[PDB]
TrEMBL record, chain A:
This is 60S ribosomal protein L14, putative. It comes from Entamoeba histolytica (strain ATCC 30459 / HM-1:IMSS / ABRM). One of its GO terms (biological process) is ribosomal large subunit biogenesis. InterPro entries: KOW (IPR005824), Rib_uL2_dom2 (IPR014722), Ribosomal_eL14 (IPR039660), Ribosomal_eL14_dom (IPR002784), Translation_prot_SH3-like_sf (IPR008991). It comes from the Eukaryota. One of its GO terms (molecular function) is structural constituent of ribosome. GO terms for cellular component: cytosolic large ribosomal subunit.
Automatic annotation (TrEMBL), chain C:
Residues 1-122 form the Large ribosomal subunit protein eL20 domain. Keywords: Ribonucleoprotein, Ribosomal protein. It comes from Entamoeba histolytica (strain ATCC 30459 / HM-1:IMSS / ABRM). Belongs to the eukaryotic ribosomal protein eL20 family. The lineage of its organism: Eukaryota, Amoebozoa, Evosea, Archamoebae, Mastigamoebida. This is 60S ribosomal protein L18a. GO terms for cellular component: cytosolic large ribosomal subunit. GO terms for molecular function: structural constituent of ribosome. GO terms for biological process: cytoplasmic translation.
Automatic annotation (TrEMBL), chain D:
NCBIfam families: PRK05518.1. Residues 12-94, 117-183 form the Large ribosomal subunit protein uL6 alpha-beta domain. Coiled coil: none annotated. Belongs to the universal ribosomal protein uL6 family. SUPFAM superfamilies: Ribosomal protein L6 (SSF56053). This is 60S ribosomal protein L9, putative. One of its GO terms (molecular function) is rRNA binding. One of its GO terms (cellular component) is cytosolic large ribosomal subunit. Keywords: Ribonucleoprotein, Ribosomal protein. GO terms for biological process: cytoplasmic translation. It comes from Entamoeba histolytica (strain ATCC 30459 / HM-1:IMSS / ABRM).
From TrEMBL, chain E:
One of its GO terms (cellular component) is cytosolic large ribosomal subunit. It comes from Entamoeba histolytica (strain ATCC 30459 / HM-1:IMSS / ABRM). The keyword Ligase does not apply. GO terms for biological process: negative regulation of translation; translation. The keyword Ribonucleoprotein applies. This is 60S ribosomal protein L13, putative.
Length: 130, 106, 173, 193, 204, 251
RNA sequence: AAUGGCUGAAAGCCUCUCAAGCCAGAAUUUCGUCUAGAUGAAUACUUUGUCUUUUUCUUGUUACUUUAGUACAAUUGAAAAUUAUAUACGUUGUAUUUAUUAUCUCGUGUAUUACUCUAUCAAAAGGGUAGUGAAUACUGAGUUAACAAAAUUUAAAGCAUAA
RNA sequence: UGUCGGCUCUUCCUAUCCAUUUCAAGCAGAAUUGAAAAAAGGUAUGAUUGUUCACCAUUUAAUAGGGAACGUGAGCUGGGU
RNA sequence: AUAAACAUACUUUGAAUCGGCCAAGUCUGGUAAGCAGGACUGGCGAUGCGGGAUGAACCGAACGUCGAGAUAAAGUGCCAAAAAGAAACAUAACGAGUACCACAAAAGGUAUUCAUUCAUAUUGACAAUAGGCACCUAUCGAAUGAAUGAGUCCUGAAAAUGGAUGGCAUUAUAAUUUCUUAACUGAUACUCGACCGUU
């Protein structure tokens, strides 16, 4: 049986546009293609807007006691109560999201040390097995 | 020694269905997949370096080059227009062209 | 697609200069809105632009383009046989947004181009007045479905390589 | 129109065990094991538990679910659900197909092989050619009585085809079939138990 | 530089005409292609209608001399070269040169079975197709039209699957030990300074 | 306009083009389908036609109205002196048909077989298989041969014996022998090579291959006629006597 | 193929399916058989063992002859299958060309290798055993660079001998 | 641009005459009639007429209908025009 | 009102020409014709260039020699320069695919999508089962039945050398209908600049 469902309160991840790699919460299902994401604008900056399902991805978290057409006030309370931001950052996608930001601030000298250091560490790990 | 260039493919000249304008040559720089990544390369040097099997009795170089400049984007898939000192030979279609890093603007 | 509020009056022998003709016209721009407005007057009240003055042609915007509403567009279109009156239900957040859906649905299901459809009125219906069989399945509060066979999403055209290394997989998504 | 979700299920009695591995159901019961492959790329089959009685308890049910799809596709949920029901029924109470023999003037002899995996029809309408008619793996023909045979097996798809195979080999050709009512027919289809 | 490398394309689970368009465009761009398993490609249409299209194709033949007429190649490795050749310039040096850089083989020959494979997301049947649509493998259609060697490839592939299967397990143990050995020296105190650098940039 | 009367076409298109062969011996283009549940055996032979006679044969068939005294039939006489096996070759099934793998040859090779590898024997040095023979018993060569035997049993599916005739036993003036590859239809490839190795240098008689009252196939080259007209080549109808420019042609 | 059937929904029943899945059924289609046939493969002998061109001898080919020129072993390239893919994760977000810290010298042993070479068993293998070299990690220290130069990738003349 | 027919020969269409596989009948059998798949095979001998056409006497499983510059004159004949 | 001084009004001498053809939100004769003949206009003739694959007339636009730029008709899976996203009725078929254009009709379908009207839908409508084909009882519990209209699909749909959405090919499209994005490609036409000639 499928685990992740497009439901009300399902936490979704934006994959393209100005808010790429930003969390969102579904609070309405217009049809099979369009949903209304209201990932709290005061928390993640995602405005209340209608997006196509081809632009977002599902996650393993659902915010409890979220009804369709929830106001930004009550929805913000349920979002922080569930500690969604805390749990998301420990997931494989969350560690991959912070990695993209982290490696994007490297300079030429930064890439020099990593390439030299890891190449020495990787070679040593090969020696350790006989 | 080191690699200080990005290979670009000489796809062909600027053309239409039944015409051809060899003044401008189209290039596909490696790693540029959209026209928004082109602003960096507009103005960078481009060299078509080829090898000629000269004879030991001559003094002409065995490695000659034609240089040019990337001038403008061409389409939405990161294709560029390059104008060289001499028009590229059509025999060099699909070969690799070095896209240098100068004139630098950083 | 934009909505306009247009008013005018007729100043000649036949019409007294104290009757104001209001309208709410959905047009791509404001020049088309007046063009639609004038033909409505010419075919219904014998009023022509040469004997009339426009008063106010102002755009109309959605008060709450964040609330999902169920619409009900009453319209008449022309087919090969004759003329028919149709009623269609749509779910959208803006009045102009739903009208574009109606135009795209009419031009696909009925193959009717835009210069055959006249929009009589558009209202908002409740959560139980929806009669479209497909659209009636998405009005409930307890609606859920696993969106499956997703194509993996590309962040932007920047990373869209023509040839990829390794196997390609879909997503339970 | 497109249905958001079509749900069908089959109940598993206590004697049979069902294990599903990528739309490949194997059902083993008191009479044997039956395997099948439902290679439809738009059905999810998974064992679960669901209450099926208005005021009854929870029981083990194999659930077949088809999400958004046209009526051309949603018609397969009941088809696949019925097949597993026959698979469950086949290994619990095997199917039997009582076949009778009708002739006008020429007696017909049914020479069933010793094992029961083959038959032989002789002197059909005074003919010299002998109809052999093999049987599928898992179907056994037996002589119930005089001018009557029955087929035994676990798979209703194998049994019914074998029963129809014998009839299809004994058709009257180039003659008025409204008068020459000859051949091996099917009286009724029932269960061994 | 000169691109002497070869882009190995594993044609499994792809579309015949969508692979060709991507390959034929990139053959003109000075790239050497080798398409392994050109009989696992998928063409829209059941085996019944796919034979009808082939029946029409076999009709085209020079009436006065069949040996001059269109030559219909039944091998799937030749049913892709024809499809690729249709999207290349005809009767010029540019098109002939761009076809000499293309190869299908039915199985996976000695050099091309241990190279890195590449896929074409624009041609995968999981993206461009409705799952309920019935398709047809080129190898399956090849037998219906008279391709004799459909059993040699099926057997040769099987012995290749059970050769790579034991290689994969052997390297799995080698990689597991290396990964667990790298974690040991990453946690060593003598390597603390280097790990501090990597941890800052998120590598470790 | 349609032809007035319909008649069958003259000649057969199953044999076009009609190109004359180059070698007198005709290579058989197939072999009987192999069965792996039988003792390996040779599937062919090679003989020289001598002529034809006629034999009065007593009919053993039943339900036939043939005379009891015996029917009259023609019979061809095919003299088949024993052939000498001088090697064996294994074949492998690839995606381009059978591909020969190796060819293990015998230690001693007759001069008849040597003549096949030259065009002017009387001028040749006649050193065919000279290195193969003088170095046959070396440890390097013996180890190499064992590799060839072992290679066939592992990566081959067809075994054929390279058997040749003996020109000394026939009235033909030809001295060079005729070489034919005879397949070994029988058990697994392991026991096919064992059968093949046992046959090296051993003459094979025709009775070992073919039995009694056995139906066989014959492949050979027909009698030459040279340039011929349309009437003989295709059997078309000769033109009326009045015809200008000739009678024996297709109008 | 036409057609007759099996199970079976849609449409609780019915139904051969303008549904998924099967069977039987032609002077039919494809294998199998026959003829012509391209790129080819195996073996025998003559050779050659980094490579080419212009001449040139011969009925013709190959080896062969002369004057050159050029490189000299040692980190490149593989899970398979499925996609409504058991469960969990979604591991996000740049395929080839294109991932080596300038060269050289002195340093101690150990360990590693789809690395090279030698011997052996095997083998139409990124094979096993033994030995040796190369590179790398433990892991250093020391010299030099300024102006010049850092290109083979193909040339020219012969016919003594052997097949 | 050699203007009818016939002779010789090859090929193509199916709107099928026969043979093969099927369904229906006011199909008991036999003989038939209507229709589907299917163009790979076969589809004649003569009196009269230049005739295409026609009408007869037979034989045959059947003696189907047409195209290819109203196929085919540096292929024939010259009976007609 | 607008435009007009290389405007306006001409005078003299004279060449060639009066076989025309095409398009159409046109007409007459004709069953009809790439047939015959007319009213108004625009074209080919006398005309190249970009597009429709190829085409005297169709679409854009009319040409001194060039450099650079936005454009026109129309296109953006490959041949072929140039697109990404959104929604639907299509597609189990030589179905669909660039007007003039190189073809298809009447009719039929419990094939499919949408809409309108009417009746039954509850504590119980239909189908099924059991009891006394219609009728009534219980379980079964949610949509059921009827008519009509508009799109798409299937049948209707048979000709002679082998072949033509241009070809390869596509099939929740790379087809069709409509959209969105300060997207793109491109003529000898437009803008700027340089030079040659006429006025």
């Amino acid at each position: 049986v499928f685990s992740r469902f497009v439901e009300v309160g399902r936490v979704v991840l934006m994959k393209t546009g100005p808010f790429a790699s930003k969390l969102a919460v579904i609070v309405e299902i217009l049809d099979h293609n369009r949903v209304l994401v209201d990932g709290p604008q005061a928390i993640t900056g995602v405005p209340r807007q209608v997006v196509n399902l081809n632009t977002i991805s599902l996650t393993s978290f659902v915010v409890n006691k979220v009804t369709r057409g929830m106001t930004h006030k009550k929805l913000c309370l349920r979002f922080t109560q569930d500690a969604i931001i805390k749990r998301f950052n420990k997931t494989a996608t969350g560690k991959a999201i912070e990695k993209r930001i982290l490696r994007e601030k490297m300079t030429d000298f930064d890439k020099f040390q990593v390439s030299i250091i890891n190449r020495k560490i990787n070679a040593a790990a090969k020696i350790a097995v006989s | 020694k080191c690699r200080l260039h990005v290979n670009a493919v000489f796809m062909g000249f600027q053309r239409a269905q039944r015409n051809q304008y060899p003044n401008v040559a189209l290039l596909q720089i490696s790693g540029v997949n959209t026209k928004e990544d082109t602003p960096f390369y507009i103005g960078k040097r481009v060299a078509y370096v080829y090898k000629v099997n000269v004879k030991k009795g001559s003094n002409k170089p065995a490695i000659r080059a034609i240089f040019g400049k990337i001038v403008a984007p061409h389409g939405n898939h990161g294709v560029v227009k390059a104008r060289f000192l001499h028009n590229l030979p059509p025999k060099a279609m699909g070969q690799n062209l070095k896209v240098f890093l100068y004139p630098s603007n950083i | 697609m934009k909505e306009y509020y247009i008013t005018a009056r007729c100043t000649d022998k036949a019409h007294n200069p104290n009757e104001i003709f209001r309208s709410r016209v959905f047009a791509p721009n404001y020049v088309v809105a007046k063009s639609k407005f004038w033909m409505m007057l010419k075919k219904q009240h014998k009023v022509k632009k040469i004997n009339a003055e426009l008063l106010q042609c102002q755009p109309i915007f959605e008060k709450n383009p964040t609330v999902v509403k169920n619409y009900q567009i009453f319209l008449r279109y022309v087919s090969a046989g004759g003329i028919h009156n149709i009623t269609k239900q749509y779910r959208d957040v803006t009045r102009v947004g739903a009208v574009r859906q109606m135009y795209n649905d009419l031009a696909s299901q009925y193959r009717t181009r835009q210069d055959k459809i006249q929009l009589i009125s558009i209202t908002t219906v409740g959560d139980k007045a929806v009669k479209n069989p497909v659209l009636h399945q998405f009005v409930g509060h307890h609606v859920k479905f696993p969106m499956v066979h997703c194509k993996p999403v590309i962040a932007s055209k920047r990373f869209n390589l023509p040839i990829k290394a390794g196997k390609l997989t879909t997503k339970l998504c | 129109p497109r249905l958001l979700k079509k749900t069908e299920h089959v109940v598993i009695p206590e004697g049979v065990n069902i294990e599903i591995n990528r739309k490949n159901i194997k059902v083993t019961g008191p009479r044997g094991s039956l395997t099948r492959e439902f290679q439809h790329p738009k059905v999810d089959i998974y064992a679960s538990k669901l209450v099926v009685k208005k005021e009854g308890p929870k029981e083990n049910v194999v659930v077949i679910d088809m999400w958004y799809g046209n009526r051309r596709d949603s018609a397969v949920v009941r088809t696949i659900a019925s097949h597993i029901k026959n698979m469950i029924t086949g290994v619990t109470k095997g199917y039997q197909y009582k076949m009778r023999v009708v002739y006008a003037h020429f007696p017909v002899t049914l020479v069933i092989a010793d094992d029961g995996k083959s038959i032989q029809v002789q002197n059909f309408l005074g003919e010299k050619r002998t109809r052999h008619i093999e049987m599928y793996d898992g179907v056994v023909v037996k002589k119930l009585g005089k001018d009557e045979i029955c087929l035994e097996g676990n798979d209703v798809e194998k049994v019914s085809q074998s029963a129809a195979n014998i009839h299809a080999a004994n058709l009257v050709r180039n003659k008025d079939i409204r008068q020459f009512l000859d051949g091996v027919y099917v009286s009724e289809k029932c269960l061994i138990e | 530089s000169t691109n002497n490398k070869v882009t190995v394309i594993d044609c499994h689970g792809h579309v015949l005409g969508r692979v060709a368009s991507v390959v034929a465009k990139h053959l003109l761009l000075g790239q050497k292609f080798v398409l392994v398993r050109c009989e696992d490609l998928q063409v829209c249409g059941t085996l019944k209608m796919r034979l009808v299209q082939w029946e029409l194709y076999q009709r085209k033949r020079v009436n006065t001399n069949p040996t001059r007429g269109a030559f219909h190649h039944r091998s799937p490795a030749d049913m892709v070269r024809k499809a690729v050749r249709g999207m290349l310039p005809k009767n010029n040096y540019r098109g002939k040169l761009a076809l000499k850089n293309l190869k299908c083989f039915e199985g996976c020959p000695a050099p091309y079975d241990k190279m890195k494979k590449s896929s074409i997301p624009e041609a995968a049947a999981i993206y461009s197709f409705n799952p309920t649509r019935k398709r047809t493998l080129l190898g399956e259609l090849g037998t219906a039209v008279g391709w004799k060697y459909a059993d040699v490839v099926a057997k040769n592939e099987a012995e290749r699957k059970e050769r790579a299967a034991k290689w994969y397990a052997a390297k799995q143990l080698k990689q597991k030990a290396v990964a667990e050995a790298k974690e040991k020296i990453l946690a060593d105190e003598k390597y603390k300074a280097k790990v501090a650098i990597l941890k800052k940039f998120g590598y470790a | 306009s349609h032809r007035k009367f319909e008649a069958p076409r003259h000649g057969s298109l199953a044999f076009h083009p009609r190109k004359r062969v180059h070698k007198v011996r005709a290579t058989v283009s197939a072999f009987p389908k192999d069965n792996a549940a039988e003792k390996p055996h040779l599937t062919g032979f090679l003989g020289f036609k001598a002529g034809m006679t006629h034999v009065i044969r007593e009919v053993k068939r039943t339900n036939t109205k043939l005379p009891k005294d015996g029917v009259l039939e023609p019979v061809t006489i095919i003299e088949t002196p024993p052939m000498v096996v001088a090697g064996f070759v294994g074949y492998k099934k690839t995606t381009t048909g059978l591909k020969p793998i190796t060819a293990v040859f015998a230690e001693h090779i007759a001069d008849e077989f040597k003549r096949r590898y030259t065009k002017k024997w009387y001028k040749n040095t006649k050193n065919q298989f000279a290195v193969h023979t003088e170095k046959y018993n070396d440890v390097k060569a013996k180890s190499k041969r064992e590799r060839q035997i072992r290679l066939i049993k592992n990566r081959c599916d067809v075994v054929r014996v390279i058997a040749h005739t003996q020109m000394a036993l026939v009235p033909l003036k030809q001295k060079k022998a005729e070489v034919m590859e005879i397949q070994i239809n029988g058990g697994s490839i392991a026991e096919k090579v064992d059968f093949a190795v046992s046959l090296l240098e051993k003459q094979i008689s025709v009775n070992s291959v073919f039995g009694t009252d056995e139906c066989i196939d014959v492949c050979s080259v027909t009698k030459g006629h040279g340039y011929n007209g349309v009437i003989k080549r295709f059997g078309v109808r000769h033109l009326p006597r009045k015809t200008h420019r000739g009678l024996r042609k297709v109008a």
